[model samples]
Target chain A: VLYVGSKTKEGVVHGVATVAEKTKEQVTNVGGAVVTGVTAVAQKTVEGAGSIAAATGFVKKD
Target chain B: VLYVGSKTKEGVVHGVATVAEKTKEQVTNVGGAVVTGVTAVAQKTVEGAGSIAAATGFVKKD
Candidate 1:
């Protein structure tokens, strides 16, 4: 037979698990946003580098 | 000649830096919330354990 203490411990464990699930969801959402932002910045940097390189070549050819 | 390409590259770098800073802020906020949630759950679990232990002792004493 399960005692009251056992039941109470189970309830607390369940509650903690719920909180952990929510926290994981929240963290995952933030991590996605961070990845998106970083990707955008990296793309911009690459484009800018290409433009700069092209301009330098044009100046040398003149 | 100081090329347009160079200036454009500089601008892009600056923009990326700004985006990185903003992302850091967002991640930091979410991280703090996650920590707070975990701490609260841990405290609750500790308290629950104590209560359960106390009840078990009372039962033994009776």
Candidate 2:
């Protein structure tokens, strides 16, 4: 099986982390060629992703 | 005494203001034991961080 995962803000993803944690029960539930276990680590607190996008081109607008 | 600041998404960060600024040019130009003067609004925008992870969970197939 194959798994794909990505993270984005306002529909633009910045980074991606992929892992395999699919079980037989889980695989059988959703028939697919690959089983992926993707989780967001920024569901709580404001340390994951807030309104701020990538700091590559971030500038305070006046 | 040291002070910390925090702001909420729905709450306004007012009533508390500090007059502390840091200038990169000045600090790099010469020695900086304690030069407290310069001028900056010392402001920050609302919010913090959130989900920077992918939302990809997998299920099994039968």
Candidate 3:
């Protein structure tokens, strides 16, 4: 299982609905992986990692 | 709407007022809301929050 966020499925419906529609003040530059399941975040400076599992990059669950 | 980071002073960094500068992942909070890089997904009502970080409809950008 290799996952690094939105690997497909329309990138998890366009990266979790465009990051929940920027609800407030800051969201920052943001780029690269942010998965939804599995895992794969081989460290590229890991600016973000929420966790769905995978390693180099991660995101999602609950 | 009040926003500033890398908000160091007399100590170093902080270019005059503020706007991300100090190798990123900076921090300084009061009224809240200071997201660097990017990681979102709190979905729905609330987060009129003064500050926060940790949620995932989920995903990251590492």
Candidate 4:
């Protein structure tokens, strides 16, 4: 699995996942922030390129 | 409060939050894309600089 880390506003290593289909909803509902930039990271792929937006801003309740 | 918006692969605008700590994890776990690039955005700031990465790529089951 790929490991993507982001620096939260407070300067801590923020980690999220993209391995499962429901992972995104789970992440947002649990109070985790969704970054808006690169959405996927795989083997031999780095979280580079693209821009970061806010993923938490896109959460909708089902 | 900071609001983040991203276009999913389908071209829909999704919004996420950046005010809380656990927001990142929420975005990833719920099938939301954890953009990796610029993580933090505040007032009078645009979602510029930094690169987008996949935050969902780094999740460990605790």
Candidate 5:
């Protein structure tokens, strides 16, 4: 997702973790060849966000 | 997020619902200036996914 504006705050956080996990489950449950692209992007996005979130001390916790 | 490639099943499901809920909480709890953009994107993404999920019978329950 792109956030457009001046003086923008850009970074992922715990939310990204949740997004990753949920998206993983989604990709797993909705298994099919049609969603490969969506799944790939979602996974990559989540991974990148997860890293940033962890570095920013926003890691997800159960 | 951009889902690249072809023959992709581009649609949000119940999993998106979960992501939306969790992300909302995450944003609410981790309030700050540094994460505003992330929070906004997260919220918008979740909202868009949620709508799709609901329409596609992928809405989360319990």
Candidate 6:
């Protein structure tokens, strides 16, 4: 097992983090006062990449 | 005020949501069994766009 020790180090402008007691994780929290720029692109990127995965069979379709 | 009505629409797939009591928001949670494809790109996208902003001065830099 491992721990990010978290955004605990500071300078954490905007992002997310997730954890899995048994499986895995992602960034679960973020701030736009900083991430707005990133968010816009990522949001769109999210829909596209995710949609692609579903089609590519990398992500579930149903 | 306003709400996404939430991932409450269901399909509640892989994503995140954030809310501001007075100011604003973003996706706060996500699942990869569904979003791994999206997550991979988004994570790297996040750092890049975010770093770009920090440099461009769109996102704060400390």
In order, what is each prediction's RMSD in angstroms? 33.1, 26.8, 22.2, 19.6, 19.8, 21.9
Deviation from native of the Cα of residue A15 in model 6, angstroms: 16
Candidate 5 C-alpha lDDT tens digits along B10-61: 2212222123322222222212112211222232232122211111212224
- The TM-score each candidate achieves on chain A is 0.10, 0.21, 0.13, 0.15, 0.14, 0.20
Tens digits of per-residue lDDT, candidate 3, A14-59, equal 1222112222332232332232221111111123432223213134
Compared with the true structure, the alpha-carbon lDDT of candidate 4 equals 0.34
List the DockQ of the predictions in order: 0.01, 0.03, 0.03, 0.09, 0.04, 0.04
lDDT of 5 by residue, A1-62 (tens): 65433332222222222343222222222211111112111211221222212112222343
Supply the DockQ value of model 1: 0.01
| lDDT over C-alpha atoms for residue A3 of model 5 | 42
Give the per-residue lDDT digits (tens) of candidate 2, residues A1-62: 33344432322222333333323321222121221222222222333334211111112243
Residue A45 of model 4: what lDDT? Answer: 17
DockQ of 4: 0.09
Query: What is the per-residue lDDT of model 4 for residues B1-62, given as tens digits with 9 covering 90 to 100?
Result: 34444422321222433332232233334443445344322211134344334343224333
Q: Which portions of model 2 miss their true places by more than 4 Å?
A: A1-50, A57-62, B1-9, B21-62
User: Model 5 off-target regions past 4 Å?
Assistant: A1-52, A56-62, B1-6, B9-15, B18-62
Q: Write the per-residue lDDT of candidate 3 for residues B1-62, one digit (tens) a residue.
A: 33332321121111122132233232333322232343322211122322223332224343
User: Which lDDT tens digits does candidate 2 get at residues B1-41?
Assistant: 33444433322122332332323322111111122222111
The residue-by-residue lDDT of candidate 6 on B1-62, one tens digit each, is 33222121212123444432322223342221122212212222222322222211122232
Which digits, one per residue and each the tens of the lDDT, describe model 4 over residues A1-62?
44444432321122333232232333233345554334322111134333335343333434
Candidate 5: pairs in clash: A34-B9
* Candidate 4 all-Cα RMSD: 19.6
In order of TM-score, best first, we have 4, 6, 3, 2, 5, 1
Compute the lDDT for candidate 5: 0.23
- TM-scores across all candidates? 0.14, 0.16, 0.17, 0.18, 0.16, 0.17
| TM value for model 5 | 0.16
